Amino acid sequence: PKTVNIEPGSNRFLDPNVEAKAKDIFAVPEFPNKAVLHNWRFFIKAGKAATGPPVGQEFSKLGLKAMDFAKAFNDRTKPHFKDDIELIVRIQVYFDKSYIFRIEPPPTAWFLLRAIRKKRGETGPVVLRGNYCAYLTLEMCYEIAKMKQMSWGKVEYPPIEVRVRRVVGQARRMGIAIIGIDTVHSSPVKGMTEKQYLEESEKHRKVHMIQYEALKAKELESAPLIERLHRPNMAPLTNTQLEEGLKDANLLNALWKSSHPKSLFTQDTRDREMARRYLNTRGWFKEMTPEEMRVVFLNYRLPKQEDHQRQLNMTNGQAQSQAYWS
Amino acid sequence: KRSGKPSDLPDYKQVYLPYDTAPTKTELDRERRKFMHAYSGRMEHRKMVEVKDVPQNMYTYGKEGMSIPISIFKDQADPVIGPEWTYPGIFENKIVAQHWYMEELFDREKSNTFESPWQRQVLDNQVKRRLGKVAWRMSMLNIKTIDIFHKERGA
Amino acid sequence: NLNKRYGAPYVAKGYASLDPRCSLDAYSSFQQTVTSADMKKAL
Amino acid sequence: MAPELQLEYIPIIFTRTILGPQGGFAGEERLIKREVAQKYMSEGNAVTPSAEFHQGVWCYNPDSEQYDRFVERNAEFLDFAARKRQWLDVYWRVNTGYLLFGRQSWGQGWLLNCPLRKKDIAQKLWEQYKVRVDPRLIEFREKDRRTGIQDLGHNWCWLYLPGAEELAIDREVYDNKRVKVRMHIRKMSSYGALY
Amino acid sequence: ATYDPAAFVSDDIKKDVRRPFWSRRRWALSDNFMVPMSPKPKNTIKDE
Amino acid sequence: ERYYALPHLRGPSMPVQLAQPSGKYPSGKFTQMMEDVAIHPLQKPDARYKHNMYPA
Amino acid sequence: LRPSSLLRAYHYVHPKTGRPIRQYRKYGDPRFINNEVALIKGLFALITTDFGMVTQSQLENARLAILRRMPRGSFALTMHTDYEEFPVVQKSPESRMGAGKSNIHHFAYKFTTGVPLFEITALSSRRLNQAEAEGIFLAGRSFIPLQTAVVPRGRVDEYHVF
Amino acid sequence: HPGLVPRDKLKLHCEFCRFHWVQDTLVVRCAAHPKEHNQREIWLEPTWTWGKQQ
Ligand SMILES: [Zn+2]
């Protein structure tokens, strides 16, 4: 009937409404560069924080009337919240006894038991319990994963498609057999043939790549300048070169210079060939002209978009163009 | 543990259907009949096992337009589920996310035949763990002598 | 405590100094040829 | 044929691939002991050489675990089942054998006073078992790489049977490239002892 | 078609290395669990 | 008299695709750097808490 | 005579009389070095690198100790028993008070080199390490009166265990 | 202090359990659990002679 939005994967983060007050409370009062004494962690309900043994005790071990914090907690957690949402509080006590606490979304194990409607004790790993518990489908984990962000300052990264494999694994480790995997057949649809279902995935599953890469590359271009530096791959080196290349570092130097994507500073024939004359005495790579090295001695962690942008000779023409200006 | 568990378990409130053609009763228990089993363990040690608490209709179960009760905020109801290709990497995760025995992964690398371009990433994150289970295995032995299986086991 | 008094060419010695390799090279010369000129030089 | 006089060993074409000394492998003709062979022709690992089997025989692969693999014995295979037999005959001969010694040993450390040479193992291989090898292959243990064997009782040392890769010979012998020849040094007085 | 005894046949007089007590971790890995050689009594090998 | 003796070599002496697995648990010298391992002092690995936290 | 009409190879029984065969002392002498290696099929097995005479009570006390140090649901110990048994104090003046009945009853095995004794065999995809393995056997090895070393799955590569 | 019959049986049970050369005998000395976890290698007494302990 009504599909809310037809786009190849634009439902990545929450609604800007709920994502507005998502980080209003899930924020990190910045580390004062003090020396932490205790990093406590609690489960606390929406606003039902008491001065009892769960909270008030560990303060009272240190003489802090935690009758105050609970209020300062409820100064931030009593509204905004569906009833009975057990949050995690990361209380952090410094050597001046001044605490600083981040409220955090409920543990994903709490999410998982909700989204499947199972109580404590009903769920279990099959090797302890013998049965897959409540089903799920990947379509659901993608929304448990949207309220679970590592950096609640940067809700974007790590990406969603990369932190759903996290919540999926935590699920399987609890017995939550999701349907898209773990089973012979995916979720059956009244729409079309399995082929007319698989032929509509082979396009979607790859359209996501140019979506996922670009988001993996756009994040790369913002990464620290050292993260874009060159780190040659070590899959080619065989484990006797890989060991004879650890006793004398000279080989792991001449290698780096030998297989280094072309830049304005590495277009020195003698420099790049000085290495190439060191390896041959060591009987290392000898039948691989510079090109087929760069395509194998590249930082594999590069997104495929930029995996090419540095690839000789794509970076040979404009190579001598880009320089330290002045 | 008792704490950190949900007490109130809201129920699946189907928002809008994902189809115009009703899935007639006859075929419902004809496809659900296939789901009451789900594999487990991924090697020669493949174990087709049973799944308890099977939902009844999976044309409607999660493929679109149902709600999930992870209701958290005040103004955010049980969020609706957009269609499949509206979530990123889902039919790509279907290739990646699963129990991977390294026995089954290293024959894929030494033959460079990955079904997915991320199984090279689920491999490292899997070996980078097992090395950690050692660099912690040993940064403990620099304290004392910890000997495996040397204390009683069982009852 | 041999190999201290005697050399390494002791105990680690395959005293079979007769034919570990020559027999092979014998079948090598077998392969190539001998002919008129190979006798004419002998002539 | 008589119940009294029975062939002490009989001809046999192996269908399976048995590990043991009396064993063979796919398709070779071997005269193995009668009692053993008779529980092969019932077992199916072997079949008496009828004129038909002398060309091909349906040997066995552990892959599908049934007699499917046709191994045709042309003159080329008969140059393969010879080098592969002649090889694992040296194996099963030194591995089965237990080559003895008689040596002099005065003093207390139960130490053979003139310890053994790799010459003096190939010498007791060719003497007793007629196994003619290169004494350059016999690797001693770590305890006896320095001083030779040197001690009474049971010593063993490794004999390296090199040329076993084009014979496709593994899992039918205990170790493709070695074999444990098993010494024993039975000390004796000047009456019966040498050196 | 040459086999050189020297490649694979290695007769090296190797120094039996002490279990290094001077470092803690390498003392624990080296703990070859056959130190229960204490059952080496030259017991009756053909009777009981 | 029968004399048993090795056949002549037609292929590689030490078996390669026929090698029996080593037979001792292959915990390599690099997964537990027990001994026999030599590393350049510039390239010292894995001090993520001691002296790799401030790498050079 | 001597061995025939065996009682399934545990001990030989006289052909013309159901009495046990009462062999010689140095019959089945373990003082060989066993040529045939063992193709263990458990994950790890405890082979005897030396030779000796080991009782059944010494082998059962070892099992009761191995069965303590082992994870229960995962690995199931496997103890081999097909080997042949042998008598004890049998002879008549060589027994105490003419009680040849109560001395021979003990049955001990004559183990050569490299016989497998136990097996930490697997019942799941759970795995073991040599450190995780020797730790188990280190309890029982202190009862089995002869020298023994644990070996991993498959054919014991006796180049290394020795 | 239980003489750990061979030297090789020595194991450092506690964090404070270290090795020491107590007169040519490698031993384990711990400040904590002072004699509870102490181990001493088997060797001749510190002051032996050639006729008394060979
Ligand atoms: Zn202690």
UniProtKB/TrEMBL annotation, chain A:
GO BP terms in the entry: translation
Top-level lineage group: Eukaryota
Domain Large ribosomal subunit protein uL11 N-terminal as annotated: residue spans: 42-99
Pfam annotation, one family: Ribosomal_L11_N
SMART domains per the UniProt record, alphabetical: RL11
Protein name stated in the entry: Putative ribosomal protein L11
The organism of origin for this protein: Leishmania major
Alphabetized GO MF terms: large ribosomal subunit rRNA binding; structural constituent of ribosome
UniProtKB/TrEMBL annotation, chain C:
Origin superkingdom: Eukaryota
Protein name: Rhodanese domain-containing protein
Natural source organism: Leishmania major
From TrEMBL, chain F:
Name of the protein in its database record: Uncharacterized protein
UniProtKB/TrEMBL annotation, chain G:
Single GO term (MF): rRNA binding
Any single biological process term in GO: mitochondrial translation
GO cellular component, one term: mitochondrial large ribosomal subunit
InterPro entries: Ribosomal_uL16 (IPR047873), Ribosomal_uL16_bact-type (IPR000114), Ribosomal_uL16_dom (IPR016180), Ribosomal_uL16_sf (IPR036920)
Sorted UniProt keywords: Ribonucleoprotein, Ribosomal protein
Secretion signal span: none
Family membership: Belongs to the universal ribosomal protein uL16 family.
The name this protein goes by in its record: Uncharacterized protein
Organism: Leishmania major
